[PDB]
Amino acid sequence: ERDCRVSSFRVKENFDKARFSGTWYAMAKKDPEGLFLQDNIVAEFSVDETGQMSATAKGRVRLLNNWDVCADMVGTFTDTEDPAKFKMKYWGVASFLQKGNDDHWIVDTDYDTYAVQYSCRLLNLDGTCADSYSFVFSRDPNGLPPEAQKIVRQRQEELCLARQYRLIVHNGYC
Numbered sequence: 001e002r003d004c005r006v007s008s009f010r011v012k013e014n015f016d017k018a019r020f021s022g023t024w025y026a027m028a029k030k031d032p033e034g035l036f037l038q039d040n041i042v043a044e045f046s047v048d049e050t051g052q053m054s055a056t057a058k059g060r061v062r063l064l065n066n067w068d069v070c071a072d073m074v075g076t077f078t079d080t081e082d083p084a085k086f087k088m089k090y091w092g093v094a095s096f097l098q099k100g101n102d103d104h105w106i107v108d109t110d111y112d113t114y115a116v117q118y119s120c121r122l123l124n125l126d127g128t129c130a131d132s133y134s135f136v137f138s139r140d141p142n143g144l145p146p147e148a149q150k151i152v153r154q155r156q157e158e159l160c161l162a163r164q165y166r167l168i169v170h171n172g173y174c
């Protein structure tokens with residue numbers, strides 16, 4: 001019944017980069033293929049005077065043969081015609097860390113409590129996403145209040161992802 005075409009997904013009306021700035025703790029993640037950020041994931045968003053949004057992120061990543069490292073990542077956002085949809089160029093402070101460019105959508109936020117982010121890296125031929133990821137962020141590292149949690153679950157369902165998240169732990173690893 002429900003529409004899982006990426007082109008159908010609503011995103012945050014009138015998204016305000018300035019209001020979104022500061023520290024966001026990842027509470028939950030839906031992983032893409034070949035997942036990178038594992039846990040202890042914390043993002044820091046900024047906007048400069050030209051209106052350009054950027055971010056940094058810290059988190060544990062586990063490169064194969066199970067060698068744990070705290071990745072330190074950088075992202076810069078190019079605006080599109082939709083104020084809530086961006087192209088995110090990203091890299092690690094270390095050369096060998098994963099680099100790339102992903103769509104970055106702010107699906108919903110109330111700026112001071114919760115945010116839902118979404119990226120489709122590759123479409124299916126029917127317009128659904130073949131390879132997606134999604135973060136749920138909280139301003140409080142101890143989690144969302146119930147009213148926000150309930151809104152977020154609705155958005156997760158609207159993205160056709162609600163069954164596919166895992167919780168992100170924070171335990172000072174970094």
Ligand SMILES: CCCCCCCCCCCCCCCC(=O)O
Pocket residue numbers: 031032034035036037038043055056057073074075090091117133135
């Ligand atoms: C999506 C992060 C929010 C802002 C932080 C962007 C700074 C670089 C983030 C790198 C994330 C790229 C990896 C996401 C997919 C994954 O973790 O498996």
Ligand SMILES: [Cl-]
Pocket residue numbers: 149150153
């Ligand atoms: Cl609930």
Ligand SMILES: [Cl-]
Pocket residue numbers: 162163164
């Ligand atoms: Cl579920």
